[model samples]
Target chain A: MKAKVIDAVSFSYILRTVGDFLSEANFIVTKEGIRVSGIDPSRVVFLDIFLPSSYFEGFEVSQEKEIIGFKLEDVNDILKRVLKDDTLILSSNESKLTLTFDGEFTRSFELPLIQVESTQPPSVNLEFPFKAQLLTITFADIIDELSDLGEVLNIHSKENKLYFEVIGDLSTAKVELSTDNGTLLEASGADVSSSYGMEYVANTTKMRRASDSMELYFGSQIPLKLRFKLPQEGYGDFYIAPRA
Target chain B: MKVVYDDVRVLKDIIQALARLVDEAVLKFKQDSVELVALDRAHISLISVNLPREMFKEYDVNDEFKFGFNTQYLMKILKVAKRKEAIEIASESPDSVIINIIGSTNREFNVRNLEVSEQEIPEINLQFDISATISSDGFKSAISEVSTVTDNVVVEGHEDRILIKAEGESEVEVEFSKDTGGLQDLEFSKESKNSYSAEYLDDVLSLTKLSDYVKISFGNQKPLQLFFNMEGGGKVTYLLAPK
Candidate 1:
């Protein structure tokens, strides 16, 4: 199988968002689109990844193959070992998944092959009432506030003002980030409400290292999908499907 | 239920190692040494951690308990924990682990368990033939010196001296001789050379807070083990498996 040529930013951003909770996940290139699916051991959470064909350097699908697996934490290790300008080539044989970078001059390493089974989480076709596209810097501040509020972060958005509240008997903290300044808000829409793990929200912030804007779609208690909009051409969107 | 703070300090130090894998855990209270199992979500990387028998302030237990925990959350809470106070932990199941700060103020922190799927990991028994005792800060300085030249670090220890080698394509080969000024008396035989990810080693090496004298042990192509001796005869060993 031939390795796909991907931009370093695209590859790194994908690794950061999807690799947060998953180790080895499936990267499927079909006639329709590119998809990735991963399931946590408890089976309580599974990440279903879908990216349109618009975000590829040279989009060509000969045969879809899964690169056995890798520890999500280990991928970050490999990324740290290399640079953003380096070209990463991913290939797999019967034994290990090999990643060669920097024209193979600097590093050529292999991770032991582990079966990454295909998992299909129940599709959620729910329509969300509220959606907000905010700058990553502002969102980062809100995420840090929610993290301080305990494990669960309660999010409530009304009009142009977004409210993140942490409610508890002993401690209560409410933080609001308005779509006031031009740099503050990318796009703001209807008010939506949901409660999610602050850990997931905090972890998703890792994507901010690569992108400036984040699109957050909220549907009442439904899974929130945070998409990191890519700036460079031929790059795909990074989706972080949060924990319910 | 009153003991000493030395044991609590040592236990916290050792627990930091497993905190990377699991968030919260229960330490079983028994008559002798305490037992703890840190879960590695994918598989049970079972480590039967045994603490010293006499380090407990007040040790008593009727049954085994599983503590639910978020380690990242707990470490933050414990940042303000008093060193001289007794730390009490209570848990009923694997769902939650409650840590009680019993020193100046009675404060309790509850961390929820992120349900993890259990997987099995193969154990690699490391064999070591050569080991050296070097200054911890000295070792860190050697790493920084090598980084100026290249990222690749090869550690070679001979009977007379230990060599820290770094090579880059354009840059010259940066070598630091341990037998000289910075590193104390050199102890090694001429047959040891092992390569590792210098970046990760440098990251771990930066955490050496104790005094000089960090024990470095390795067998050919095997994992590198760093033993940081703690006060009161306790020790902290961090093993980094070879690439």
Candidate 2:
């Protein structure tokens, strides 16, 4: 099988985001696309990544599916060597996976593949009435402000508006966003609120580098879902468990 | 002795390059230039760096002396230096080196010198049959690429091309020929190949920030010599033992 990405920046972003959560993972490749799903070691977060065949500049795979196990740190290091305008090419055989970068100079790296025990991803079916899609930069700002105030972030939706409130020992801060504020693209659901770890929310906000907009789905006492759209036919979804 | 740099980046680059391997070193101040020569803890690599007096905006010296300082501590000070700022380094006594940053606000830091034993450095002059001049970027990229596959890298010099290969669980090879823009010059009296630790090579390549090209020379299983000519009259040399 062979796959190539014309844009190195997007590829590197995806690898870095995944490496942040999982040290090792399996890349499941099919004729349709590639998907990677895993939970963080602490079990506090789960991630699911999807990249359609159309996302790559060139994709060629057989009818049979393939799963290759690799260390995320190695992949991250290889991608760091890629230049901004370089093209990344991926090809794999039974034993080794080869990655090549084509720029002013051509460089190639080969890594041995190991066997990975595949498991089914946990089935997630939940109703999150409060859904909001806002500018990623705006959410990052809220996270930064709230993180400084307290360890827990209280997110509440009231009458088509979203409010982020943080209470600290010395002070308290709140950021309210609505259609009137021009920061919220859309908001729904009744009075629903949930508290999550401020650090987890802040770490996930780094997805701003991958996309301009972020879609959030959450409810009272439910998991927080953050989905970021890639430049092409790909998306990164992060699920952080709510604080007790 | 006193020296002034119009651009702080030159000094920053020197400190960063040495900090990779040598944590502390003794710098010798002379009438013409300042020189630092030291070996890593394992003694597998030797670094000799010289900054000529002409490279500085202002240089004044009445006598020569040696001052020992920790490179790691000096790097912390250099990290905060701003662009286009002038840096003045002076020694009032034998115990301290004063660094002054001249910008919007003048900041001075005094670094204490440590007592160091002066060991005679061995001088070996050997003839190398193979030599090649490669761009800094080209060499750095090759070293970084090979390091992923193995800890040791084999360098082979031929008449027409230079090859760098690493073998471990996986193997990676990079070839630089006359047609490749990376190699500027290549010479070989006899084809020679040697292996060295990739970690040491990477530490030395950190100086790429100060140089655009590096000249490499080696013979069969002999010590590898790398020479980097910096801006102005400064130069840095690294000699690594073969594995």
Candidate 3:
């Protein structure tokens, strides 16, 4: 099967961010799409990225699925040399995954495909209670601010406003987002919140480089899941387990 | 098939407007003309551009062939070539397309061709109540005046005049009639008003400098059509959906 994506910089940033939590993972290509999903060794962070087959400029796959493994850092390393207006064309052989960049001058790089230990994220079992959509920069910027405040971030929704609280010995930094502020585009479900590790939550802010908008889903006592909207209806999801 | 343009800007200018709407377009080489047809991703706009056989200085085609390329990709290559440098586009190989620039010095560029299925372009058939011809300056001024107020602009046609108006927190209006020579040759059996995206109109108008006059035709909430007459026998037809 052949795979291709137009934007190089956007996809490269995703690989870089995913490599931080998942050093190696297998990319699975099915009739629906291609995705790389896995859980970290600590079992605290799980990521599931899916791009519909139609999301690609050129996508060719058989009825049967094919799974190929690669070191996440290696892909990020090759993409570091991407040009401003380059388009990435991806193809896999029996032993190698070919990365080709087409710009003013064409470039092709190959990496050996190894067997990567893989695991799955939470599927359809858990239903998110609180869901809100906001600009990616707004959410990412807030996560950075919360990181400087405390080790754990406490998030809650009250009176239809999303609130972030971090209590520290020196200072208590609190932030609220609502439709009135024009940051929260639209929200539904219920008024609920959860607490998660500041490190995991802050690392997800790196995805703002790849996505234009971020969809946040969490519950009162469940894990926090984030959907980083990608170009052409693709998405990179992160599920962060709650802090004790 | 190989064709050369007297001035590369003729091709570059048209593609500039097209790139804003769609990323890729199939270039059709026919016996009579080189044609391009594309619809924007949102399906709200369609552009039909014609570069007739006479438009080119050297034209030769054995048979018809279609090739697709990213619009932006072609623009960068064309932009590097000077305005006076004659541009030649030829399909010498099946795998890729070749672009050559001719002047005191020679330059060549090879661009990758996308394997895209034939585009299923929509057929448009509309009968309008009013058709008005206006100066490009007048049309641009009216669109600019109304766009300052809001995103959507209402274009209304009367027996002897046309009005462009929009209301946000504030209201703006611009009129054109034959008395001032801003509008000409318009007779309306029934007045019609349609709201359209002002940015769409202005965006398309900004890149295409192919004409001094624009012929506009529309009816009650019907798709608006702008016709631009090109230098040769060629022409450009732009269509925008109503908001």
Candidate 4:
């Protein structure tokens, strides 16, 4: 198996974020692109990251499908040393995975392959009555504020306005933004409210920093889904369990 | 006990700072104000916070009472408040505290208290040879930069300048003179230098979000004391031992 990502920064961002949630991941590579999906150990968050072949400088696969196992933290650590403009080349055999970085200096690292058992992707069949799309920056700011308030974040959508709240024993914080806000692209469906672990939800702000906009979907007491479309062809999907 | 405050930002700021060092604390409610004094689990640091009654729009207390809980958990709950929203806090029984938030919409939270016994903080009466009041932003930025270079930072105080340096695979040195825009004030009875865990200092400096200035006091190899003046007549003081 072999692949190349011309824009190393974008690829690293995806890997780092996915690594933060999942310790080990099985990346399925095909002529179409690379897809990595996993659920966190706690079973509270589900992550799916996709990078299309068109987004890569070079992509080739000897077989129709190749599953590459990776210790995400080790991959992330190596990626951190790469510069933004560097070119990343990946190749793997049955025993080991090799990563080559071409930049100011040529650097390469090899990681031993380990079995990363794959699990079936969770079926996302629940209908979300309330949905909204807002600038990722706005979403990040709101989460930053909510993180200070409490362990659980309450999100409510009514009519044209969406409200976020955090309540603790000492104080409560709330942020109100509506369709009138320029950052809000769209809003629809019945009024809905849900609460989630602030820590888990806050982790998605890393996606906000990488993408321009984020789409949110949820229903009463349902899991929160956040979709972030990357600059060129990839996308990141996050699903966080609600606090019952 | 009952109190109402329009600005929850200060509460959020203070609690976030406290959580960095201590998980559990005793909040004593007095007729006029509330206070919390605790030490970090390691006992290497001490934190004291005071919020005056004047900061509250409405305050009521029949007698002094102490409530204990996890600081990190309570801080998470307080952070949900918006800057302009009015927050109401009351406890009908000693077992739990109720918080009400009013802004665009109303929300309430009920948190049970932990069975924590209060402990007296030993009186600190050490004299320092150097004291300085520096811009919180500058010091915080310097500490963060130094942390990248080394796990520990050396703080050197001279008559007219303060120097922060860290050495590892890389070396970083930042000097703040009395005339520097960020220094504000610097005084030294004698030149003194000490080394401390950059990690600990970084946690303490997180309070920069709550205040613009941080007053520092220390002597050679002695504990470092940082005092942050909060809004509404509140004060947060942290004492960290040198490494």
Candidate 5:
């Protein structure tokens, strides 16, 4: 496959986010858009990434085939070895992924792709009783506050006030938010509560560099779906299973 | 919350070299032992490191997390860090350190910690025969001169003279002889001689730690050690075996 060179800095940021969470997958070069779907061993968390060609420079699609098989982990490893330079080229065959720089100095490496089972996307038909449109930056701030509180964070929504509660036998932290600034989009009552891996959510939240706001939708006994609106046409969504 | 002032460029220079082998992220908290594999890029030379946890302060960690990071990138950030800003490292993972730069203007840059896997490193313990104090400026100039003459520098001591000699690739020898001068504070009693990988020694010595006086010690054909004691209680040391 042939790829174009864009900004190294921006590319690095994208790679960093993917590296932080997902393990193995391909940046599927599709005619419609670029996509990647990956599930950890537990399948408790799933990441679906989409980016339209309109977002890139000199974007072109030569082949429209489901290169059914490429591992970003292997490609990222090679890129890591390179000192941050301009223009990185990625091309892969059935066996190896060859990464070149500035027209010279090429490095090739290999890794077996995980046998991803053919599975349908998780059904999202369940009605999300609670919903809110939060300023991405403000949401990040709450995540930080919850982190400072303790490890396990209890999130509950009641009558227009969203409450982030951190409960420990010796320490407790609670942050209450009301519809003040245009930032807090929507908040509804009907008390919903769930405990999640704080670190996981926090790490995923940092990936908000691409968006200004997040649409959060959840219900009692439902997975948390954090919708990150991309600057371009496409979007990226992170689905996290609630902690039992 | 504390601001430590020093040349960011100098700190970066010191860490770049150290990161080549002793990944600072991993070595930062090895309560046990991490081995070092030093070679000529060919045959393995001296592959050992026996750093006691006592050498480092007990940093507080709220979670059990381990990760390795890119020391080069870390050093770059540290080097460009505002002189008045303190680099705060919050321990949360074995694979990462939460790094934040606290500045006066309220502008904060937070970076995810670097990550490294656990790999077996070697360890070595050696006894030194002599330890002596030397002026930072003088040592800097001495190492420069020694490097010019040869890639190998021989350090030996006599009754009242400490000798630093470098034999060039052409067999021409250049030597520096200093009278016991300030070596008196070093607490040296016996005379000893040893050779070291000048390249590695150069990196270790390049530390701005040289802005202050340094203490050097070595045994006959044993490891050469240098220490950089900070103003308060912070101390960093470098120990390398003979060539």
Candidate 6:
């Protein structure tokens, strides 16, 4: 599989933050795009990321579905040095994945693909009662604002609006986000409240650099699921088990 | 003491820079101005930040009073406030302080003051053989560019040019001459060169974001002083002791 993208330096931030969870992940390369799914060691969170073919300027799949795995951060290291206007091209064989950064200077880095220990993705089956979609920037800002408050963040819905509550040692913070404010694109939900680890939610906000909008789904004491949309109908989705 | 600053970015950015140096700071509230003698844990860098009476929208202090706070905690509180909003700090007593940020809505947060006592701090005086006023962005770029390879950087200030170089497994160097737009202005007394920890210099130099131009002064084996003139008569002077 070979994929090319311009202005791809932002993906480095996506991988750097993703390294906080999974050490190694298999990139399922197919005609559609690349799909990455992994679960943390603690199994507290599961991430399923999709990169659609239409998102890339050039995409060619030599095989139907190829599973290529690598140490995630090693790839991030090379991408971190990427310049602002650099174009990125990625192609992988069975042995090694080749990355080329093209600009005034062409720099290429190759790292061997690992024999990925198969870790089956956990089955996430829940009928959430509340669902909302909003721009990634607004969602990231709200999560970032509440991240400093405490370890646990309480998310609830009331009167068709969303509310975030944080009980911090130093202070208590409460914010309301509603469709009327034009922050959320759509909202339809039951008045349900759930809590999740603040750190987990905060880590995923970094995905805002790559995704444009976020679709949120959660219910009373159910797991929180966030699907960050990308270009051409691709998305990077996350699932965080609810905190008691 | 109660004070209101119209721009939350200035207040938040100042505290952010200060928190990078010292974890806790004793805010000195005087009749004339507000100040913080910010010194880092290693004593390698010292910052003298003054927020003058003219900088704030409301400066209400009957007498000279001081309060101690955790700079990191204050930074967190300020980060929650929007950049375009106004922030009001009020402390009715020494026990706790209140922060009310006004934007689309009013959000109030209270934090307890640290039980830190005021101590006598000695004044610092240093003489530099050469000095230059350069664009802050230019200065940061040169310093940041060469720092990728080494932990220490050599800065040479001469009669006609300034050079910054660092060497490790890799080598990077940057030079600015009199005619270069980067060297806005310069004055030379004696040719001097010195090296300092890249870590400390980078940490203290970010105060440049508040100012368009920065005055940098240094002598042979002497400390580096960065003088940033902020808006509204405010000033942040950063000093980094040589390695």
- Indicate the residue-level lDDT of B18 in model 4: 75
Worst 10 residues of 4 chain B by lDDT: B101-110
Top candidate (lDDT): 6
User: For model 2, what is the C-alpha lDDT against the true structure?
Assistant: 0.77
**Candidate 3 lDDT by residue in tens digits, A61-174:** 844787789888888889897898898888787588889999878899998899877575456656888888988987876676457556888888876777777655433445
> lDDT (0-100) at residue B21 of candidate 3?
81
Candidate 3 residue pairs in backbone clash = none
TM of each candidate vs. truth: 0.45, 0.50, 0.49, 0.58, 0.46, 0.65
Candidate 4 lDDT: 0.78
Ranking under DockQ, best-scoring first?
A: 6, 4, 5, 1, 2, 3
Docking class of 5: incorrect
For candidate 1, what is the DockQ-based docking class?
incorrect
* Residue ranges of candidate 2 with Cα displaced over 4 Å: A1-244
Which pairs of residues clash in candidate 6, taking residues 3 or more apart in a chain or in different chains?
A: none
Candidates' C-alpha lDDT: 0.56, 0.77, 0.78, 0.78, 0.55, 0.80
lDDT of 4 by residue, A60-155 (tens): 886898898999999989888788668888788877888889887788889878899786665556678888887777787678756766688888
Give the per-residue lDDT of model 3 (tens digit) for B61-167: 76876768777666655664544779888886655677666643334455565665556877784677677877767787888888888889888898888888886
Please give, for residues B1-243, the per-residue lDDT of candidate 1 as tens digits.
222333344445445545654655555444454555444443323333555445555545455443334555555444434355566655555565545555423344444534543334356444565577777776777767776666666677666566666756644333334645544544454367775556555545533654356776665676666666644343445565554
lDDT of 4 by residue, B75-187 (tens): 76676565567777778788877676655434456667566856667776467778888877877877888988887888778888887788677878888887766678776
Error of 4 at A18 (Å): 1.8
Worst 10 residues of 3 chain B by lDDT: B103-112
- Give residue B153's lDDT in candidate 2 (0 to 100): 88
| Fnat for the candidates in order | 0.00, 0.00, 0.00, 0.16, 0.00, 0.27
Off by over 4 Å in 1: A4-10, A31-33, A41-46, A50-56, A64-74, A93-96, A103-106, A121-124, A168-170, A183-191, A231-244, B1-243
Off by over 4 Å in 3: B1-243
Q: How many clashes (backbone atoms < 3 Å, residues ≥3 apart in a chain or on different chains) does model 3 have?
A: 0
Q: How many residue pairs clash (N, CA or C atoms closer than 3 angstroms) in each of the candidate models, in the order given? A: 13, 0, 0, 13, 18, 0
Candidate 1 Cα lDDT to native: 0.56
